[PDB]
Amino acid sequence: TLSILVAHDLQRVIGFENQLPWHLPNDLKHVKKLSTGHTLVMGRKTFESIGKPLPNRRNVVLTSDTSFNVEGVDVIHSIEDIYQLPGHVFIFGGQTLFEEMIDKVDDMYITVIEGKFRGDTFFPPYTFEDWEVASSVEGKLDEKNTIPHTFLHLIRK
Template identity: 70%
Template sequence: MLSIIVCHDKNRVIGFENKMPWHLPNDLKRVKALTTGNTIVMGRKTYESLGKALPNRKNVVLTRDKSFQPEDAEVIHNIDDIYDLKGHVFVFGGQNFYEQMIDKVDDMYVTVIEESYPGDAFFPEYTFKDFKVLSIEEGVLDEKNTIPHHFMHLERYKND
């Protein structure tokens, strides 16, 4: 299974100056719940923005830089190598990687921030002609989660 996992604002912003422009613990908990025990694949800049591999899951970095060898993550240099990874694989960003994979994934786990933020990295456009909505869940607002948001699970329509 090949999935995208992403959090974007209402204008599809996913980052600004190699950081997420918001702090939303509900989204971080969801990412942890979905990806723990599985594999996440990200571009080098996304890995560097995290500062280290995320625990309790296989971290894979896609980069053209043959000298890039982090101690806590596996490295692949060809996008097609993603298909050799076992189990449930999540495309974890950033923009360029999402653009290359959006037409190839089985489903997407999307957190939508219902506000606008400044950004220089964006999630590609997608439509509900390509994906059907399996679920939409409103995010709970509290003292730590003050930004209106919702979670969607989208599945690609199969051409049967």
């Protein structure tokens, strides 16, 4: 299985100055649940914005930099290398990788942040005409999660 995993706002904003424009604990819990034991694939900027691999899953970074070798990180150099990864593989970001992979994924796990943030990086446009709603779950609000959000699992038609 090849899946996208993304949090985007109402305008499909995903990033601002190599950070997430929002803090949402629930969505981190969502990601843990979903990806632990599996593989995450990310572009070099996405990785470098955190600088440390996520524990308890396979962290793969795509880059043209042939001297990239962070401990706990496996490296790939082409889009093609993705199809050679065994298991459930999550396209994890960022914008440029999402743009390359959106027409190739089986399904998408989208967290919709029901807000409008300033951004410089965006999830590619998509229409529901192409995607079946497998599930739509409204996120729960509290003191730690103050921003409305919806977990969408979308499967290609």
